[PDB]
Amino acid sequence: LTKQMNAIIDTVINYKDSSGRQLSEVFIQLPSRKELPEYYELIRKPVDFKKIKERIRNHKYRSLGDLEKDVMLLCHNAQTFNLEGSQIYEDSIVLQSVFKSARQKIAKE
Amino acid sequence: LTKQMNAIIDTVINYKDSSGRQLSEVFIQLPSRKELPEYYELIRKPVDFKKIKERIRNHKYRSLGDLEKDVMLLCHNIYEDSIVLQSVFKSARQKIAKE
Amino acid sequence: PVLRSVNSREPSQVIFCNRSPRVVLPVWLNFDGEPQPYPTLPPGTGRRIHSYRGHLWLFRDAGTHDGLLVNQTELFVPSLNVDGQPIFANITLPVYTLKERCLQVVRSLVKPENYRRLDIVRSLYEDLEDHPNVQKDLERLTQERIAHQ
Amino acid sequence: VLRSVNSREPSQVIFCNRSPRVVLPVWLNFDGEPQPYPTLPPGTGRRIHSYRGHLWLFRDAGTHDGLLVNQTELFVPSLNVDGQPIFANITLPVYTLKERCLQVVRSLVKPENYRRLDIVRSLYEDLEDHPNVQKDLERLTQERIAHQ
Amino acid sequence: VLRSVNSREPSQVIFCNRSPRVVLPVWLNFDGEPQPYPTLPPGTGRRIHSYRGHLWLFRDAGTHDGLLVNQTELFVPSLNVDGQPIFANITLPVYTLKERCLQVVRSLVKPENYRRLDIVRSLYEDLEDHPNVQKDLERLTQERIAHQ
Amino acid sequence: VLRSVNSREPSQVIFCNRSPRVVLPVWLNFDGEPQPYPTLPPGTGRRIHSYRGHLWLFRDAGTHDGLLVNQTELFVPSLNVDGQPIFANITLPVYTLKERCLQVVRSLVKPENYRRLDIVRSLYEDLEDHPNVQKDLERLTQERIAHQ
Amino acid sequence: MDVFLMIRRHKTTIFTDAKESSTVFELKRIVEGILKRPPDEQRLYKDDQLLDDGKTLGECGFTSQTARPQAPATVGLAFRADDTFEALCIEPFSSPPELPDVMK
Amino acid sequence: MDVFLMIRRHKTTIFTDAKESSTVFELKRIVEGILKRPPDEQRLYKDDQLLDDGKTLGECGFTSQTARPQAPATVGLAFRADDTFEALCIEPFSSPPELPDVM
Amino acid sequence: MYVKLISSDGHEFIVKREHALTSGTIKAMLSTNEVNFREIPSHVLSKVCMYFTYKVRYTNSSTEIPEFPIAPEIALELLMAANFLDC
Amino acid sequence: MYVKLISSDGHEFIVKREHALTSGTIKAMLSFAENETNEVNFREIPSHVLSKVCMYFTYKVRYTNSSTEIPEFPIAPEIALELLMAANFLDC
Amino acid sequence: MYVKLISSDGHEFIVKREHALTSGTIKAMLSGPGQTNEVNFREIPSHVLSKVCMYFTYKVRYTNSSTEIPEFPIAPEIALELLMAANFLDC
Amino acid sequence: MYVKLISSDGHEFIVKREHALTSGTIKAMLSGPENETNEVNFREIPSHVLSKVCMYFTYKVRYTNSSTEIPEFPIAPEIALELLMAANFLDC
Ligand SMILES: Cc1ncsc1-c1ccc([C@H](C)NC(=O)[C@@H]2C[C@@H](O)CN2C(=O)[C@@H](c2cc(O[C@@H](C)CN3CC[C@@H](N4CCN5c6cc(-c7ccccc7O)nnc6NC[C@H]5C4)C3)no2)C(C)C)cc1
Ligand SMILES: Cc1ncsc1-c1ccc([C@H](C)NC(=O)[C@@H]2C[C@@H](O)CN2C(=O)[C@@H](c2cc(O[C@@H](C)CN3CC[C@@H](N4CCN5c6cc(-c7ccccc7O)nnc6NC[C@H]5C4)C3)no2)C(C)C)cc1
Ligand SMILES: Cc1ncsc1-c1ccc([C@H](C)NC(=O)[C@@H]2C[C@@H](O)CN2C(=O)[C@@H](c2cc(O[C@@H](C)CN3CC[C@@H](N4CCN5c6cc(-c7ccccc7O)nnc6NC[C@H]5C4)C3)no2)C(C)C)cc1
């Protein structure tokens, strides 16, 4: 399960779009509250892509549906805070679409 | 000499003006080059006072005239404080070194 | 240095709310106390703007450079945030003197080269030509602070 | 935890009601008990004498519906800088469609008739659960013990 | 399609107004909405503190007439090399004689009086079609879908 | 060092001479040897083909006096974004009154006659120290070993 | 400010926004994106009269005060039979029940 | 726009800037600040013509393009003695020595 | 993208996906661009969308928010629909 | 207690005393220093102007020190110049 | 090569062909089968056609040219008739 | 504040303090311990020179940190040598 969970989370991070740019670069590490106090006043449950790798080693996620529930939570957290049509908004729309195709290849093939 | 050098450098740092505000924090720690590339392109020999407290422990300054030479260098490297500090260091060395 | 921002290092979240009928030019006084133009607020708009505490601001009609008010006064200085609450800058028309208000309207209708064609006193002509100005007003505000001190 | 702090330092404030509703300013006292204050008609503003650290809260005087002040739920005036007044901008929140519907139904139907509406039993209970300063204060505490 | 890119990497820029006109710098936001910024008087230059990948556009603050920056329509600062500032040179384009005439007529006649000019009907429409940042942005999008 | 690195990626640039002087563009080659290029008359501006990462320097073609490009001493074209040309704005620096006086004296008196001027020998030595690309390049390296 | 609109050809109803400033053509393009029919096959009507591809939404009549998010302005849509661009057809929404005496 | 000025009376020369839009009166006030003599004891001349307190420097003839920092425009100054004003007198600056033979 | 909500009487409502997701029950159903509501009439589902438009636009708007109006005639059926949707 | 302002063409305007005092020129004219004068006569101010000058007094008195929002005091082009003249004379 | 443009009142304007070709409508009249050096404008007066040439001078000169371009001035008195002439020509 | 520079022939030049400080020599003479006194006397610098030295202060202060083009600081042949001397003495 840990080998499968790493294949899905690493594919979403390593994923580059059709101009060669990596999308996860901004999502890899959440900013500090001193930096951006608004994110932590609006976003209820802040989580990043390294806090998901942390919870894959600590075995907090019991199934591949619990790993998905918190990748949708940050991708939806990001979408809320940012402007619609923003660079970061539409990539959390793509990172949900690349996670839903990455889990569908590893978990059943 | 180290006890005297600490009394002079700590008096200049702890020194508050007549509104209660401490002048030294803007000299206690130098900024990073990433932050402000203009100071490290225009200023030749960047030194803060934490780098002066460092050189008081390492004993790089041989006299009280060598400690002064590099406090004048950073203060020469808030417009008035660059000077107020020079004026509070020149009265702090004059009280400790001869009384 | 009299009327200037202060290097606080402590960020203050602020909400610029333009309740004037005019396009508003937010003007940040820098640490030296030199006016710095910032992006304009359309009438009836509000924005959250990242700022620092002790920073001193000032608002004006982006077009005419006419004087505005923020929280029923001329200068706005954000307080340190309490528990993350954003401080609020409410920007409004002042009650202009009838004269100054008339000047505003005449100035807005007549090209400056035609002020000479109006059958008015020369002093009024000079007043029309005098256009309101951040710097002139800053000089006045300092003398009003040395008169309180 | 949620209470005013006896301060001795005055803080002049401007209560600006930019809601369509009559606004009930609610001052939390030192013990932290809600105290109703004089109402602000829609589209009005008043300068009020308050103190530093005093905690306020605003609501629809009629329905006791929740309002917002400076995009948040509680207002605490900072120390005045140079005598200039602090500003409390009171506005509607974006109510859930449900809560908003309840508001309208509640305003049209007498509480004894909620039982006559051909709706789900759960909705009857929701209709009967009128909004309330104290219930909301309890919630706000748990939301501050969850941030600790 | 046409928007600034959130970068967090500062890029010092020099806005140099070498047009005879008052220049309105227009920053495209991340959402890609034009944002008016403070005007540059003719023959002036300012250091601007923008960010990498931020997209800008310049125009006659009065007429909303199209200007050029570095002989093109959009300016996007590169990351600074060795602390050296980027330069945005803002100038008049060579307007068509027609468009230039429209500019002058539009500047002399109130829009409600365009109807009173003893001219061809097509020109009435041309005078009415005032230049516009949004119209031009829409055009620039189709010119970028045509180059891909 | 002042490398002028081979790119193979072209970078269109606009050399704009906004100095009152005839400008000598000086391209540092890959070995880092100054290469004189065609002079720009005062108030002229031309599109030139350079490559990304190529390092340039500008000077008074006559006196070899130091100029500035985008308020700095070196110009390195960034990679063009969307084909937009980069801009090199070449200007006078604010010379010290001394250096400026030297410039004028040097321009009026033949170098073999510097000795005949009823001035101090130190000033004569300063006159004799004509400005020089190579001396200045050496200084710029020690200013980069000082940022290390 | 923006303008909030409902385009309702026949049974269908599209909910979308646009700029106060923007063009009737840009709106046709958004419809193209959803219903997969180009701007030259659609004609857009405000009430009973067609709006030209060239006009600013402002000039057509749509402003903040008539096209609010909770009271979107209704733009009519006509789709093209190859022989003729079909006449404007809008399908009326379901009626609400008579106001119960309890709410009077 | 900025205008750069030398206000000169006798052997005194004041170097200062002022706006085209600023007024002859405002300039007299700056002089008051330095030479401690009010605007009603001062007369300001552009060349030989007296300047009215109410006119803008612009209207008097001073422009940014003829009052540059390194070529300041000269405003003449006269003070009042009792019931009469002194003549406008601007004592000239020292002459330079004949151009040395090399130049 | 966009999403299609279909009323009992069979009207089609095309609204942005993110606008629709404001409804927990829709969020659940789309977790597919279609959803059919056999018990929600058009005059109701039309207004439910208008709320999505409103909520999306005015959430996190500092200066002023306008009251989301509901006419008596629609109030009860909307309350029903509202609760079913979780909007 | 009210005050009577009389225009050139001889219209009478009865406005509150405090409203009128917003004009320095009027304050001067009102304030023989044993008791108060009700009338003041403006030889060179027509009615269509003095009427609007009062409307300003109404406006100024009402909206001075009012907290949330003040509206712009409108002046039609047709009246603008004569009002500016009157305004400067009155000191309002 | 120089082309001759002739105004209504009958002034002759000799301008370079390349300068003239800036007008799409003149390009048409010259590159067409015709029966050239001359073109006659029966409805364009001299004070207008003179300024139309001045534009050709301007356009040709300040195009394919980089750092600064100056405003092409048009006096109010001529503005309307020039706009007409301008439209009738390609620019 | 302002500062008074006095030439050999005895002309007085009143220039802003900050403008004068452009000269290290002047900075030294003023900042050297009322304190920072208004006047400084140059017995070896004539007016036609010290006048131009001020004009440079005006120029330097104004055009330092000007982002676009700066104009040439002109020096006539007749004055060039004496100015160079004065310039070196002043450190400006
Ligand atoms: C959309 C829209 N619409 C309408 S309005 C608007 C809008 C509004 C705002 C913004 C943006 C996001 N916000 C802003 O622009 C805000 C607003 C207003 O608040 C100013 N500000 C700014 O950004 C300034 C600003 C930044 C800063 O940060 C300091 C704390 C810190 N930095 C600066 C001062 C340096 N100091 C660094 C040590 N340094 C020295 C150190 C030493 C030294 C010597 C020896 C030993 C040790 C030492 O440290 N020596 N010398 C030094 N020199 C001075 C000092 C400088 C760091 N504060 O203000 C910016 C613009 C200036 C966007 C849209
Ligand atoms: C005088 C004069 N005359 C003529 S013009 C002019 C003038 C010139 C300048 C100004 C003023 C002073 N300057 C401006 O107006 C400039 C210019 C133009 O460029 C816009 N701008 C602005 O200031 C915008 C602006 C400011 C900003 O600053 C960020 C880069 C710094 N931020 C820290 C944090 C980072 N981001 C990091 C990911 N982060 C997010 C992360 C996540 C996330 C991450 C991990 C896991 C899950 C997650 O969800 N999600 N969302 C994120 N979004 C936020 C983002 C923040 C960037 N950038 O732009 C202002 C206006 C917006 C005035 C006049
Ligand atoms: C009008 C006016 N007014 C005022 S000024 C002015 C003006 C300005 C400019 C010009 C003229 C027209 N322009 C210039 O002078 C410009 C400007 C400045 O930038 C220098 N420059 C030049 O032209 C140099 C120049 C040209 C070049 O082009 C290469 C990038 C592209 N070349 C193909 C191939 C590549 N390299 C490929 C690996 N290759 C090697 C490979 C290997 C190797 C590889 C694998 C395994 C084993 C191997 O050994 N080994 N060695 C290699 N060496 C060559 C290298 C080539 C190069 N770059 O710079 C010219 C002058 C030198 C006119 C007026």
For residue K2, being part of any structural domain is answered with no
* I60 neighbourhood in chain A, CB within 8 Å: 42
Q: Which of J35, H5, J23, J61 is nearest to L16 (CA)?
A: H5
Nearest atom within ligand 1 for CA of residue C49: 8
Q: Which of J78, H42, H23, J46 is nearest to C123 (CA)?
A: H23
Q: Alpha helix (H) ranges present in chain J?
A: 17-20, 24-30, 47-63, 77-90
Contact call for C123 and H54, based on CB within 8 A? yes
Angle, in degrees to the nearest 10, between helices C98-109 and C122-129: 70
Q: How far is CA G4 from the centre of its chain?
A: 9
- How far is ligand 1, taken at its centre, from the CA of residue E86, in Å? 20
Residue J19 buriedness (CB in 10 A; 0-12 / 13-18 / 19+): buried
Determine the Cα–Cα distance for residues G93 and G76; give it in Å rounded to an integer.
14
- What is the 8-class DSSP label of residue I27? H
- What is the 8-class DSSP label of residue E78? P
Determine the Cα–Cα distance for residues C20 and F65; give it in Å rounded to an integer.
54
Q: How many contacts does A have with E, using Cβ atoms within 8 A?
A: 19
Bridge partners, residue D59, by sequence: D24, D66
Q: Are strands L2-6 and F45-51 parallel, antiparallel or unpaired?
A: unpaired
Q: Which of F45, F53, F44, F38 is nearest to F8 (CA)?
A: F53
| N residues, chain E | 148
**Ordered DSSP codes for L66-77:** --S--------H
Consecutive H or E run containing B2? helix B2-14
Residue A69 buriedness (CB in 10 A; 0-12 / 13-18 / 19+): exposed
* Alpha carbon nearest to ligand 2 atom 8, residue: E48
Determine the Cα–Cα distance for residues B39 and B32; give it in Å rounded to an integer.
10
Determine the Cα–Cα distance for residues C35 and C58; give it in Å rounded to an integer.
9
Ligand 3 — pocket residues by CB below 6 A? F 6-8, 15, 25, 27, 37-38, 40, 46, 48-51, 54
Angle, in degrees to the nearest 10, between helices A87-106 and A2-14: 150
Q: Alpha helix (H) ranges present in chain F?
A: 97-108, 121-128, 133-145
**Token pair in block for residue F19:** 């100095």
Residues C61, C133 contacting (CB under 8 angstroms): no
Angle, in degrees to the nearest 10, between helices A2-14 and A64-81: 30
Q: How far is CA F91 from the centre of its chain?
A: 10
N-terminal to C-terminal alpha carbon distance within chain F:
12
DSSP three-state, residue C71: coil
Can you say whether the dihedral through the CA atoms of F115, F116, F122, F127 is positive or negative?
negative
* A41 neighbourhood in chain C, CB within 8 Å: 84
For residue I53, being part of any structural domain is answered with yes
For residue L24, being part of any structural domain is answered with yes
Q: Which chains touch D (3 or more CB pairs under 8 A)?
A: C, G, I, J
Residue F116, C-beta contacts closer than 8 angstroms, at least 6 positions apart? F109, H101, H102
Determine the Cα–Cα distance for residues D64 and D24; give it in Å rounded to an integer.
8
Determine the Cα–Cα distance for residues F91 and F111; give it in Å rounded to an integer.
27
Q: Which ligand is nearest to the CA of E7?
A: 2
Residue G98, C-beta contacts closer than 8 angstroms, at least 6 positions apart? none
- How far is ligand 2, taken at its centre, from the CA of residue E6, in Å? 7
For residue K5, being part of any structural domain is answered with no
Residue L34, C-beta contacts closer than 8 angstroms, at least 6 positions apart? none
Bridge partners, residue C25, by sequence: C60
**Token pair in block for residue D99:** 């809560």
Determine the Cα–Cα distance for residues F82 and A34; give it in Å rounded to an integer.
36
| Contact yes or no, F with C (3+ CB pairs under 8 Å) | no
Determine the Cα–Cα distance for residues F85 and F104; give it in Å rounded to an integer.
36
Residues of C with CB under 8 A from a CB of I: 15, 17-19, 44-48, 86
Q: Give the angle I77-I80-I81 at the CA atoms, nearest 5°.
A: 85
Residue D146 buriedness (CB in 10 A; 0-12 / 13-18 / 19+): exposed
Determine the Cα–Cα distance for residues C108 and C117; give it in Å rounded to an integer.
15
For residue L69, being part of any structural domain is answered with yes
Strand order from edge to edge, sheet including J2-6: J12-16, J2-6, J39-41
CATH number, domain containing residue J41: 3.30.710.10
Q: Residue C50: phi, psi to the nearest 5? A: -75, 135
N-terminal to C-terminal alpha carbon distance within chain E:
12
Q: Give the angle B19-B22-B27 at the CA atoms, nearest 5°.
A: 140
| N residues, chain B | 99
- Residues 73-132 on E with a CB inside 8 Å of G are 132
Determine the Cα–Cα distance for residues F50 and F5; give it in Å rounded to an integer.
12
Residue D110, C-beta contacts closer than 8 angstroms, at least 6 positions apart? G102
Binding-site annotation, residues of B for Zn(2+): 59, 76
Q: Which ligand is nearest to the CA of F88?
A: 3
Q: How many contacts does A have with C, using Cβ atoms within 8 A?
A: 8
Structural domain for H6, as ranges: 2-103
Consecutive H or E run containing F49? strand F45-51
Residues I16, G48 contacting (CB under 8 angstroms): no
Residue C24 buriedness (CB in 10 A; 0-12 / 13-18 / 19+): buried
Residues C37, E24 contacting (CB under 8 angstroms): no
Determine the Cα–Cα distance for residues D117 and D110; give it in Å rounded to an integer.
11
**Token pair in block for residue G6:** 């409902």
- Residues 38-67 on A with a CB inside 8 Å of C are 38, 41
- What is the 8-class DSSP label of residue J6? E
N-terminal to C-terminal alpha carbon distance within chain B:
14
- The 10 Å Cβ neighbour count of residue H54 is 13
Tell me how many domains chain L contains: 1
* A87 neighbourhood in chain E, CB within 8 Å: 3, 5-6, 30
Determine the Cα–Cα distance for residues E87 and E80; give it in Å rounded to an integer.
11
Q: What single letter denotes the amino acid at residue D110?
A: K
How large is the C-alpha radius of gyration of chain J?
Answer: 14
- How far is ligand 2, taken at its centre, from the CA of residue A92, in Å? 19
Residues E105, K83 contacting (CB under 8 angstroms): yes
Bridge partners, residue H68, by sequence: H71
Residues H14, H59 contacting (CB under 8 angstroms): no
| N residues, chain D | 148
Documented resolution in Å? 3.2
**What's the Cα-to-Cα distance from H78 to each of B50, H22, H86, rounded to whole Å?**
58, 20, 6
Q: Which of F110, F114, F111 is nearest to F124 (CA)?
A: F114
Residue E27 buriedness (CB in 10 A; 0-12 / 13-18 / 19+): middle
Q: Which of I13, I32, I17 is nearest to I81 (CA)?
A: I13
Q: Does I63 touch chain C (CB under 8 A)?
A: yes
Structural domain for J44, as ranges: 17-89
Q: Which of D148, D19, D7 is nearest to D76 (CA)?
A: D7
Determine the Cα–Cα distance for residues A13 and A52; give it in Å rounded to an integer.
11
Q: Which of C97, C100, C54 is nearest to C78 (CA)?
A: C54
Q: Which of L77, L76, L84, L16 is nearest to L45 (CA)?
A: L84
For residue K3, being part of any structural domain is answered with no
Residues C47, C8 contacting (CB under 8 angstroms): no
Angle, in degrees to the nearest 10, between helices J47-63 and C98-109: 120
Q: Give the angle I75-I80-I86 at the CA atoms, nearest 5°.
A: 115
Bridge partners, residue C67, by sequence: C60
* Residue bearing tokens 């009700």: J38
Determine the Cα–Cα distance for residues A21 and A19; give it in Å rounded to an integer.
6
HSE-up of C134 (CA within 13 Å, CB side)? Answer: 20
- Please list, residue by residue across J32-57, b when 16 or more beta carbons sit within 10 angstroms of its beta carbon and e when fewer do: eeeeeeeebebeebebebbebbbebb
CATH number, domain containing residue G48: 3.10.20.90
Q: Residue L28: phi, psi to the nearest 5? A: -60, -50
**Token pair in block for residue D67:** 């309002």
Q: Alpha helix (H) ranges present in chain G?
A: 24-35, 57-60
Residue H100, C-beta contacts closer than 8 angstroms, at least 6 positions apart? F117, F118, L81
The 8 Å CB, 24+ separation contacts for D139-145 are D140/D2, D140/D73, D140/D74, D141/D1, D141/D2, D144/D1, D144/D2, D145/D1
| N residues, chain L | 92
Q: Give the angle A31-A37-A43 at the CA atoms, nearest 5°.
A: 80
- What is the 8-class DSSP label of residue D87? E
Residue J75 buriedness (CB in 10 A; 0-12 / 13-18 / 19+): buried
Q: Residue E119: phi, psi to the nearest 5? A: -125, 175
- How far is ligand 2, taken at its centre, from the CA of residue E32, in Å? 14
N-terminal to C-terminal alpha carbon distance within chain K:
21
Ligand 2 — pocket residues by CB below 6 A? A 26-27, 30-31, 35-36, 48, 74, 77-78, 81-82, 88; C 37-39; E 6-8, 15, 25, 27, 37-38, 46, 48-51, 54
Consecutive H or E run containing L47? helix L47-63
Q: Which of I25, I4, I30 is nearest to I81 (CA)?
A: I25
Q: In this structure, what is the dihedral angle of CA atoms D68, D73, D79, D81, given to the nearest 10 degrees? A: -30
- Please list, residue by residue across A29-57, b when 16 or more beta carbons sit within 10 angstroms of its beta carbon and e when fewer do: ebeeeeeebebbeebeebbbbeebbebbe
Residues G92, I81 contacting (CB under 8 angstroms): no
**Token pair in block for residue H39:** 């605007």
Strand order from edge to edge, sheet including E45-47: E45-47, E13-17, E86-91, E68-69
Determine the Cα–Cα distance for residues E63 and E60; give it in Å rounded to an integer.
6
Determine the Cα–Cα distance for residues E123 and K83; give it in Å rounded to an integer.
9
Residues E52, E7 contacting (CB under 8 angstroms): yes
Determine the Cα–Cα distance for residues C59 and C37; give it in Å rounded to an integer.
10
Q: Which ligand is nearest to the CA of F13?
A: 3
Q: Give the angle B50-B52-B55 at the CA atoms, nearest 5°.
A: 115
Residue B74 in contact with ligand 1 by CB distance below 6 A:
yes
Q: Which of I1, I78, I81 is nearest to I39 (CA)?
A: I81
Determine the Cα–Cα distance for residues A20 and A10; give it in Å rounded to an integer.
17
Determine the Cα–Cα distance for residues E32 and G21; give it in Å rounded to an integer.
15
Can you say whether the dihedral through the CA atoms of J73, J76, J80, J86 is positive or negative?
negative
Contact call for A37 and C11, based on CB within 8 A? yes
Q: Which of D73, D87, D93, D11 is nearest to D45 (CA)?
A: D87
For residue J4, being part of any structural domain is answered with no
Residues F69, F49 contacting (CB under 8 angstroms): no
Q: Where are any strands of DSSP class E within C19-120?
A: 24-29, 35-37, 45-52, 56-61, 69-70, 87-92
Q: Give the 3-state secondary structure of chain H.
A: CEEEEEEEECCEEEEEEEECCCEHHHHHHHHHHHHCCCHHHEEEEECCEECCCCCEHHHHCCCCCCCECCECEEEEEEEEECCEECCCCCCCCCCCCCCCCCC
Q: Give the angle G57-G58-G62 at the CA atoms, nearest 5°.
A: 75
Phi-psi region of G91 (alpha: psi -120 to 50; beta: other; left: phi over 0): beta
Q: Which of D85, D82, D89, D52 is nearest to C56 (CA)?
A: D82
Q: Residue H97: phi, psi to the nearest 5? A: -65, 150
Determine the Cα–Cα distance for residues G22 and D122; give it in Å rounded to an integer.
46
* Alpha carbon nearest to ligand 1 atom 11, residue: C50
Tell me how many domains chain G contains: 1
| N residues, chain C | 149
* Residue bearing tokens 């400033």: G21
Contact call for I63 and C48, based on CB within 8 A? no
Which of I62, I64, I76 lies at the smallest CB-CB distance from D119? Answer: I76
Binding-site annotation, residues of B: 59, 76
Experimental method: X-ray
For residue I25, being part of any structural domain is answered with yes
Residues D69, D58 contacting (CB under 8 angstroms): yes
- What is the 8-class DSSP label of residue A22? B
Q: What single letter denotes the amino acid at residue F129?
A: D
Contact call for K66 and F18, based on CB within 8 A? no
